[PDB]
Amino acid sequence: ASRLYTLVLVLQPQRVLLGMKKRGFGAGRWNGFGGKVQEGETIEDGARRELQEESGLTVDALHKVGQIVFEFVGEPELMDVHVFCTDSIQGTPVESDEMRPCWFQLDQIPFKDMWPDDSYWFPLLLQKKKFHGYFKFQGQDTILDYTLREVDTV
Numbered sequence: 001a002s003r004l005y006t007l008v009l010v011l012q013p014q015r016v017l018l019g020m021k022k023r024g025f026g027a028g029r030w031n032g033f034g035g036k037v038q039e040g041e042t043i044e045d046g047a048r049r050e051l052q053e054e055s056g057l058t059v060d061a062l063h064k065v066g067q068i069v070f071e072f073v074g075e076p077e078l079m080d081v082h083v084f085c086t087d088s089i090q091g092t093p094v095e096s097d098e099m100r101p102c103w104f105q106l107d108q109i110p111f112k113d114m115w116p117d118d119s120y121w122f123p124l125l126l127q128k129k130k131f132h133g134y135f136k137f138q139g140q141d142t143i144l145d146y147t148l149r150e151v152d153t154v
């Protein structure tokens with residue numbers, strides 16, 4: 001019982017792009033860009049499509065960096081999140097009704113206003129490490145338990 005999702009981090013040598021989500025799941029938190037994968041669409045194409053829809057940016061090269069499974073106690077579907085990174089983009093980030101993008105210096109990543117699991121795996125993402133993770137949540141603020149390990153192949 002799992003549903004595919006993508007998450008794209010535009011990570012440049014001194015900064016990362018995050019978007020403040022205005023409504024829906026995760027509203028009020030800074031997130032990477034992503035969403036559900038369509039029928040007949042590859043995960044990578046879904047990731048490129050969501051990055052454009054949510055940030056206005058066109059990604060050139062995308063790299064697989066992780067896989068994170070989210071469980072919400074009482075929710076039947078697990079979120080199978082395929083995480084990607086890019087340093088090569090085109091366009092300028094666009095603020096829309098749905099998302100407010102902002103660049104953050106790497107030492108100023110706003111973890112207090114992000115999903116709690118980000119504090120766990122961002123340190124790996126910042127050091128160019130790949131990972132497999134699983135986070136069990138109670139509501140949207142509490143991590144009941146988790147696993148996170150570094151991998152050679154996502």
Ligand SMILES: CC(=O)Nc1ccc2c(c1)ncn2C
Binds near residue numbers: 114118
């Ligand atoms: C950076 C980012 O968007 N991370 C993120 C994105 C979505 C997440 C999550 C963490 N933890 C649970 N959900 C649903």
